[PDB]
């Protein structure tokens, strides 16, 4: 599993389905947003679409 280098979205894809940036296997932490509209944590994380995200990522 990889994470978008820009938005941290988690995927097996080498390219983020949201923002088209490269993804990396080198990621840490897990935030699963089930309901972006109702999640205060998602809002603090700048997440507005459902999915799973890393907390930090590097190349």
């Amino acid at each position: 599993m990889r994470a978008c280098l820009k938005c941290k979205y988690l995927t097996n894809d080498e390219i983020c389905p949201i923002c088209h940036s490269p993804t990396s296997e080198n990621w840490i932490g897990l935030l699963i947003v089930i309901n972006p509209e109702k999640s205060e944590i998602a809002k603090k994380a700048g997440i507005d679409i459902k999915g799973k995200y890393a907390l930090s990522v590097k190349e």
Partner: protein, 84 residues
């Protein structure tokens, strides 16, 4: 929004349990909004939900979960976890 709870898990099973939780939340249509597993918080998963009952139903019979920490967690105690 409001309620966030810490769910105690086995150390090292945090992400695994977050995954099972998300699946169960969707399947059972529970009012669970997000699930957070921070590396700096071993043995616990944080669950944002409408009520404590949602979290009780979420973890009901789930392996490798020990229970729910008493009391809600304030959003300010969580924010530092967002940028590791």
């Amino acid at each position: 929004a409001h309620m966030i709870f810490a769910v105690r898990t086995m150390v090292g099973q945090e992400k695994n349990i977050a995954g099972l939780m998300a699946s169960r939340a969707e399947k059972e249509q529970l009012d669970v909004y997000s699930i957070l597993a921070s590396e700096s918080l071993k043995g616990y998963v944080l669950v944002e939900a409408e009520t404590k009952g949602d979290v009780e139903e979420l973890i009901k019979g789930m392996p490798r979960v020990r229970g729910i920490v008493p009391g809600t967690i304030a959003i300010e105690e969580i924010e530092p976890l967002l940028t590791p």
